[PDB]
């Protein structure tokens, strides 16, 4: 066991091995407070999250779980790594802290209109690391500027933080579609894509029902086919309520785009989620030929998340992340 230090930052205690040093606050959210650190075993500055009350009810310890399993799993280039995981607690019994360490990287791309060539590497590495997490079986949900961390370097990695998530929401979220598929975070990235391109949010919609209307505006009401797939009645009458509208010409709203981030927007912003183009798909579009190597695009090992659907107590979901923390493994 490493010896631990105590301190206060921002009326928050901060417990952690004397392996990290010079911990200053960068920011806070609902379910963590973050600190950049200096890792004096590695000689990398980290970012280190410490969880808020992980174990308060049985949502936050079902919350915590799946947040360290799901750090865990990550073990690509282009996704937020988990570099150690610990706890000040040295029993089961007394364990009631969870804190994570990850790479520290430089800002996020809300922070960052960009060029064209920066732009195609950006969306390359976006889509390389969602080729992986797709694979796994998993849906991020919530890609928006502020989940992408980006160094100096250009160096893009996807996190989740945990500038409205709504406007990078795949439409049939909006409507509530109990069965929406991986191609929801296909639709985030070519919002993000196109906000990087223009400067501009794609959809900056008010709600859900202005959300859903600047899309149609842009992708065109449902056509038949897509129609056919809605078993909702209210939402069947409501679409087919609207004033119609056709898609646009993508290549006259993204004018002076490279012809080739144009198509491309056309393959991930299909209306219909059966038509878009997949991760996998698209890191083969001749929009990334400088970039694309099919032999460096790997997937993941497959991902357990049957935990999903258990109904536990709150010591037990304790005890399953204690078993996680024990367990880690850090990377060479
Ligand atoms: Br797909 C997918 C990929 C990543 C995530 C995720 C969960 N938690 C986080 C990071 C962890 C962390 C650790 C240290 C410092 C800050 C942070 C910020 N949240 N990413 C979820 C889904
Ligand atoms: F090889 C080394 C050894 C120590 C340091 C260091 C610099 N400032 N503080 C520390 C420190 C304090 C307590 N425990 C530690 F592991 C590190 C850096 C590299
Ligand atoms: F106004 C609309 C109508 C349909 C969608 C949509 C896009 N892809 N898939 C759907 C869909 C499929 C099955 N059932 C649903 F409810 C929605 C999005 C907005």
Redesign the pocket.
Known sequence: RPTFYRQELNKTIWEVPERYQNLSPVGSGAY?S?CAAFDTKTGLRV???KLSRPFQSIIHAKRTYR?LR??KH?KHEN??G?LDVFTPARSLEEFNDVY???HLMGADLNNIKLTDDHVQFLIYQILRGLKY?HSAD?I?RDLKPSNLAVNEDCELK?????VATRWYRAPEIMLNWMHYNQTVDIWSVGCIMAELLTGRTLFPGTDHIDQLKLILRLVGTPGAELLKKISSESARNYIQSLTQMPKMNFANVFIGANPLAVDLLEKMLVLDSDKRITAAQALAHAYFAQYHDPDDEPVADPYDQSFESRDLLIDEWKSLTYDEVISFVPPP
């Open positions: 963590g973050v970012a280190v999250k947040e799901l750090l990550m996704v937020i988990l994570l360490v990850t997490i998993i991020h996807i996190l989740d933080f945990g």
